[PDB]
Amino acid sequence: IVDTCSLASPASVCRTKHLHLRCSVDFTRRTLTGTAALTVQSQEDNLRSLVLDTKDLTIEKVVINGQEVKYALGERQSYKGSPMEISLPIALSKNQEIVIEISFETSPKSSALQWLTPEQTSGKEHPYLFSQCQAIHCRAILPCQDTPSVKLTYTAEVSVPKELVALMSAIRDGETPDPEDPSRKIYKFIQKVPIPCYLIALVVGALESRQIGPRTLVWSEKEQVEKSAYEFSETESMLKIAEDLGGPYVWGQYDLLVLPPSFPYGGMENPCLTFVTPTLLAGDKSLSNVIAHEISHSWTGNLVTNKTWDHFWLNEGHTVYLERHICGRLFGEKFRHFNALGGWGELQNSVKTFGETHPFTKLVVDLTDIDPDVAYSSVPYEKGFALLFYLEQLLGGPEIFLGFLKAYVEKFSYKSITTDDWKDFLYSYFKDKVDVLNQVDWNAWLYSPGLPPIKPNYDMTLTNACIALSQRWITAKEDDLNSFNATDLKDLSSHQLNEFLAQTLQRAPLPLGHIKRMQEVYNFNAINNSEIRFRWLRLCIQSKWEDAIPLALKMATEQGRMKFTRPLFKDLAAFDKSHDQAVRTYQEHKASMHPVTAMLVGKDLKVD
Numbered sequence: 337i338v339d340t341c342s343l344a345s346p347a348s349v350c351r352t353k354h355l356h357l358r359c360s361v362d363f364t365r366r367t368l369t370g371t372a373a374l375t376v377q378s379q380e381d382n383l384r385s386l387v388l389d390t391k392d393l394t395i396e397k398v399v400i401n402g403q404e405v406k407y408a409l410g411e412r413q414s415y416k417g418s419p420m421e422i423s424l425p426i427a428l429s430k431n432q433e434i435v436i437e438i439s440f441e442t443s444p445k446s447s448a449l450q451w452l453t454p455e456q457t458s459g460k461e462h463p464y465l466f467s468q469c470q471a472i473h474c475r476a477i478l479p480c481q482d483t484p485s486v487k488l489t490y491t492a493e494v495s496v497p498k499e500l501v502a503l504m505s506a507i508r509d510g511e512t513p514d515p516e517d518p519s520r521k522i523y524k525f526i527q528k529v530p531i532p533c534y535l536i537a538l539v540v541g542a543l544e545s546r547q548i549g550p551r552t553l554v555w556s557e558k559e560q561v562e563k564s565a566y567e568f569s570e571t572e573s574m575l576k577i578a579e580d581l582g583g584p585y586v587w588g589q590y591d592l593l594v595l596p597p598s599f600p601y602g603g604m605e606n607p608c609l610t611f612v613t614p615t616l617l618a619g620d621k622s623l624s625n626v627i628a629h630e631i632s633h634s635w636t637g638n639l640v641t642n643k644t645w646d647h648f649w650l651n652e653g654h655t656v657y658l659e660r661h662i663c664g665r666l667f668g669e670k671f672r673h674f675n676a677l678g679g680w681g682e683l684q685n686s687v688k689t690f691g692e693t694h695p696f697t698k699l700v701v702d703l704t705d706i707d708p709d710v711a712y713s714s715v716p717y718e719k720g721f722a723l724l725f726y727l728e729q730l731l732g733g734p735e736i737f738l739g740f741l742k743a744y745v746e747k748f749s750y751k752s753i754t755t756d757d758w759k760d761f762l763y764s765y766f767k768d769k770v771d772v773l774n775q776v777d778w779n780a781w782l783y784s785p786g787l788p789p790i791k792p793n794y795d796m797t798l799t800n801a802c803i804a805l806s807q808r809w810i811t812a813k814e815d816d817l818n819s820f821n822a823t824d825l826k827d828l829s830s831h832q833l834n835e836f837l838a839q840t841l842q843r844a845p846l847p848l849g850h851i852k853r854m855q856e857v858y859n860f861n862a863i864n865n866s867e868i869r870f871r872w873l874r875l876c877i878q879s880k881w882e883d884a885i886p887l888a889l890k891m892a893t894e895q896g897r898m899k900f901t902r903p904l905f906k907d908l909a910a911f912d913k914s915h916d917q918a919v920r921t922y923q924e925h926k927a928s929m930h931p932v933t934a935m936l937v938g939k940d941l942k943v944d
């Protein structure tokens with residue numbers, strides 16, 4: 337099967353087995369410079385050339401067997417970058433391995449990287465760099481077969497200014513002063529478990545660590561360590577549950593890195609070092625499902641991997657499925673159902689926003705000539721989850737379906753698979769239930785746009801109070817507003833508060849007087865919980881409350897998680913009173929934003 341997002345030679349032609357990366361980080365030039373040594377195994381007879389992905393890389397030379405070889409860069413193909421063809425000096429037989437050492441330098445404009453000035457950090461004294469390779473940005477750091485169909489181990493040595501610390505998606509393997517430059521340090525890393533390259537990660541900054549479990553340090557700038565250690569304290573208990581459900585955690589360490597506010601995603605499951613947004617820091621551990629999610633990826637995604645990005649739902653549906661099982665183990669089955677139902681609500685929202693015929697409301701997609709970053713949404717997460725929850729109920733319940741899950745992980749560990757591999761295995765595992773599986777509308781579930789053909793069964797117990805309060809507000813007239821009071825919230829958890837706001841946002845706009853009264857009685861402006869504040873601010877802006885404009889602009893820019901930043905900017909652009917402010921604010925912040933987020937918000941706003 338073809339990876340339409342990669343220009344490199346496919347796995348049927350050759351396979352990278354190992355990367356040795358030696359590089360130096362230059363904050364003055366905003367470049368990573370060094371060598372990438374790829375141990376490549378031929379999958380063909382008489383192999384005489386191969387192609388790697390690159391994007392905005394400067395190649396100095398390519399060395400094989402101690403000598404330079406011929407290579408050429410093809411024309412750039414937009415978001416895919418430029419293909420790099422390398423002429424092998426000796427034809428390779430099948431299964432023969434060689435080492436190809438490429439000397440390269442990244443561009444400042446690397447879409448994989450954000451370079452922060454001291455001013456953009458917590459500490460204000462030192463600059464900061466972080467990577468984000470998923471889906472296809474690893475090629476903007478180093479030449480590689482940038483496709484999740486290929487898995488490799490890696491070792492790395494990274495030279496940085498001595499006042500800073502480097503971390504990677506790997507086990508830390510020592511530091512020393514840089515023997516060539518006393519103003520620098522060299523940090524070493526080893527990743528002994530084979531991984532797709534999208535899992536390669538690097539951060540360099542003024543980082544400190546705190547131990548929070550037997551195999552977990554939290555890393556961040558000093559200003560955030562204390563809050564992060566508390567917020568994620570349940571990590572080890574989640575890892576133990578995850579091991580029970582998925583089998584052995586094979587990666588050794590499970591560290592967490594809390595990035596600066598411009599980190600563009602809730603989390604990234606980089607092996608040995610999950611990256612998360614500081615917008616998780618609600619002060620009460622209430623957004624810890626994101627940690628449960630990233631933990632779960634150590635099985636579904638990092639062990640069993642999607643073969644191409646068209647099959648991304650395999651990564652996300654199964655991970656959300658495991659995530660909600662971890663939460664259910666910790667807080668009860670009724671809570672698992674509460675979050676499952678909330679996820680269905682997010683899928684409804686996506687389908688409504690995209691449109692019920694939109695190609696990216698399909699579960700299995702076709703990314704031919706589409707930038708994965710433009711396609712990305714919560715659909716593969718929630719439509720994928722819905723399919724699995726539906727199957728769980730069809731096939732005899734969670735205990736039975738968890739047996740399939742563990743078997744599936746065992747079966748495909750260290751491999752990259754397609755939707756058919758998954759469905760073939762489902763049928764084999766549940767062969768005594770084929771008659772039931774054969775009545776599943778597979779083509780609709782997998783390939784039709786819109787809401788899925790069947791909605792699962794959800795327990796309503798923790799949801800009822802959220803809907804009831806939302807409905808009171810929606811059905812209230814002016815002469816009913818007096819009856820609302822802070823006592824309304826006294827028995828709602830933060831999770832239920834968030835769901836009340838989600839329910840209400842689905843019916844937005846509300847009358848302006850309603851939203852004013854809400855603030856007057858509940859003081860939602862004072863809540864720092866990022867998920868709650870996000871929905872609250874969207875509700876205010878869509879209901880045309882001008883007072884909320886500065887609050888929404890501030891949330892949109894003072895952090896950069898796209899889940900929040902993109903919709904806030906879009907709501908602000910849609911509101912006539914804030915439109916010009918939204919565009920100008922974007923234009924003022926554009927140069928200092930994450931490159932991917934800057935591109936997407938700019939497209940969202942039609943700024944060019």
Ligand SMILES: CN(C)CCOc1ccc(Oc2ccccc2)cc1
Nearest residue numbers: 470471601604645648708709711712
């Ligand atoms: C979430 N991660 C931490 C950052 C974004 O990572 C991506 C993962 C997959 C991707 O490609 C798609 C998008 C939609 C449907 C199918 C495939 C695009 C981006």
Ligand SMILES: [Yb+3]
Nearest residue numbers: 381382428429
């Ligand atoms: Yb041959």
Ligand SMILES: [Yb+3]
Nearest residue numbers: 453454455456
């Ligand atoms: Yb400044």
Ligand SMILES: [Yb+3]
Nearest residue numbers: 756757759760
């Ligand atoms: Yb098949």
Ligand SMILES: [Yb+3]
Nearest residue numbers: 813814815816
């Ligand atoms: Yb009335």
Ligand SMILES: [Zn+2]
Nearest residue numbers: 629633652655
């Ligand atoms: Zn995920």
